[PDB]
Amino acid sequence: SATEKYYIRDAITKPAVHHESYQKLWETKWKKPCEMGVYPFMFGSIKDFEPVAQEIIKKGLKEPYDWDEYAQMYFPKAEELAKIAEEAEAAGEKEKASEYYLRSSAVYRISRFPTPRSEKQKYAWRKGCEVFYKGAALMEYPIKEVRIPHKHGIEGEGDVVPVNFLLPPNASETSPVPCVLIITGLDGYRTELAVWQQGWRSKGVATVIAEIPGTGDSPALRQDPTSPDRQWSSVLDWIESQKAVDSKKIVAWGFSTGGYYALRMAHTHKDRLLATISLGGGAHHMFDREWLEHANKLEYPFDLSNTLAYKFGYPDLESFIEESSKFSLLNDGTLQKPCTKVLLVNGNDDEIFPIDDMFVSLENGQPKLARMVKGKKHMGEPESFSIILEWIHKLLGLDGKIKEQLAMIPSRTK
C-alpha cells in the first residue's frame, strides 16, 4: 500500500492538473518560473516562451506527447534567437550576442524536456549545446567545455566525460581554489546548472558541471549501477591535474536525480571529496514498484517514472521496475560504507523522490547532516539553496555573501 508506505501518504494517489494538457502545465506550473527566469528557464525570457506556449496551447498538445511533434514547436523561436545572436556578434555586440545565444539554448533545452527520447529531441540537445557554448564563450568570464578522457571507462562506454569548467581568474598553484563539482539531474544538464558557475567564480570557487549516466553526454553504461563510479574517477583524476584547484577542497553538489549520485560518491570516492550535498536526491524507495507506479501522475512536469526508466536504459517502466532494486544504495551495500561529510536537503512533500530516502540515508552508516523543508515538494526551494550555500561557505571559509550569490541565479534578458 503506497498510501501506507511513504511519508506523503495519500498525496501519491492525487493526479496533478498539469498532466491534463500543456495548457495546464503552462498556466499552473511553467509560466511563473519562466517569468522569474528560474529553473527550468535559466538564461530564458518569457518573451521567447510565451508565443511558443500560445501555439502549443492552440494545437492542444497533451500526454501522451509525440516528442518529435512537441520539440518542433520550439525550433522556429530557437532559430530566430540564434540568428539575432549571430548578427549581434558580427556587429561586435558581445553582451547581446551572449544573451541571445543563451536564450536560444533555453528554447532548445525545453524542446528536449524531459529527456531526449526522439530524433528531434536528440537534435535539440546537440543544437542547444552548440548555441549554449557560443553564448558561454562570450561571457566576461567564459565557461568552456572540457572533454575529460574517460580513462576509467569499460566496453560500450563513451571515451569522454564532457563537463563545463570555470576557473576564477586569481586561481593559481600559489593561490589554489576550492572546486564545486555540480552533478545535474534527469532533465537539467550542464547547459542548465551552468547558471550557478559565475556566482561560484565571484566567491573564488572553480566549478565543474557533469551529467548523470543516461543523460546529456554522459558516457556511462545506463543499466550498470557502478557506471557512475568510473565516471567520477575520470572527472576527479582530471580535477587533480588542474594545479590551480585545491584537490583537498572538492565539494560535490547533486541537484535532483544528481543527489543520488552525490550521496553515492560520498561513499565510493570518500578520500577524494571534502563533502557532498544531495538536494532533492533519493537512495532506495525511489526504485520501489509502488513509488514508480504513482510518480508519473504527480509534481514532475511529464512522465517521471518512464523518463527515469529510459535514463537507466530500459525501454518501458515494467522492465525497469523488474531490475530497479539493484540501484538502491541500501541493497548494493553503499550506505554501510564510511562516507565523507554529507548534507541531505529536501522538501518533506517531494513527489519525485520520497523524503523516506532521507530517512534510509540517516538509518545507515555514519551520521549525516540533514535539513528537511516542511510543506515543500521536490528540492524544498528556495530555503534549501540558502541552507546549502551557508554550509558550503562555512566549509570552505568563503565570504558568506550567499543572498547576493542566490540573487545572481534568476536570468536577466532584454
Pairing verdict, β 144-149 and 160-166:
antiparallel
How many whole angstroms separate alpha carbon 380 and alpha carbon 258? 15
Q: Quick one: CA torsion of 283, 216, 226, 263, rounded to 10 degrees?
A: -30
Instruction: Give the count of alpha carbons within 13 A of 13, CB side only.
Output: 7
Which grid cell sits at 7?
Answer: 511519508
Catalogue the E-assigned strands of 25-120.
none
Pairing verdict, β 275-279 and 341-347:
parallel
Query: At CB < 8 A and 24+ separation, what contacts does 152-156 make?
Result: 152/230, 152/231, 152/233, 152/234, 152/237, 153/219, 153/230, 153/234, 154/221, 154/230, 156/221
User: Other C-beta atoms within 10 Å of 269: how many?
Assistant: 21
User: Other C-beta atoms within 10 Å of 88: how many?
Assistant: 19
Write the CA distances from 251 to 145, 297, 358, integer angstroms.
20, 34, 19
Specified resolution (Å):
1.9
DSSP 180-194: EEEE--SS--HHHHG
At 412, is the secondary structure helix, strand, or coil?
coil
- Among positive and negative, which fits the CA dihedral 112, 113, 117, 118? negative
Would you say 31 and 51 are in contact if contact means Cβ atoms under 8 Å apart? no
Q: How far is CA 95 from the centre of its chain?
A: 26
Which grid cell sits at 204?
Answer: 573564488
Grid look-up 570555470 returns 166
At 347, is the secondary structure helix, strand, or coil?
strand
Which grid cell sits at 265?
Answer: 560518491
| Preceding amide of 410 cis, omega within 30 | no
DSSP state of 159: S
How many whole angstroms separate alpha carbon 301 and alpha carbon 268? 32
Write the CA distances from 100 to 18, 30, 57, 134, 355, integer angstroms.
29, 21, 25, 10, 39
Pairing verdict, β 160-166 and 206-210:
antiparallel
Instruction: Give the count of alpha carbons within 13 A of 171, CB side only.
Output: 22
In angstroms and rounded to an integer, the radius of gyration of the C-alpha atoms of the chain is 20
Q: Would you name the residues annotated as active-site residues?
A: 256, 350, 378
At 126, is the secondary structure helix, strand, or coil?
helix
How many whole angstroms separate alpha carbon 208 and alpha carbon 204? 14
Among candidate residues 54, 58, 33, the one with its CA nearest the CA of residue 44:
33
At 61, is the secondary structure helix, strand, or coil?
coil
Walk me through the domains of the chain, giving residue ranges and CATH numbers: 15-140 (1.20.1440), 143-414 (3.40.50.1820)
Which helix H or strand E contains 387, and what residues bound it? helix 383-396
Q: What angle do CA 333, 338, 341 make, to 5 degrees?
A: 125
Q: Which residues of 42-51 are buried (b: 16+ CB within 10 A; e: fewer)?
A: bbbbbebbee
Instruction: Give the count of alpha carbons within 13 A of 100, CB side only.
Output: 17
Instruction: Give the count of alpha carbons within 13 A of 65, CB side only.
Output: 29
What is the identity of the amino acid at 114?
P
Write the CA distances from 145 to 137, 194, 235, integer angstroms.
10, 11, 13
How many whole angstroms separate alpha carbon 361 and alpha carbon 53? 40
Would you say 187 and 115 are in contact if contact means Cβ atoms under 8 Å apart? yes
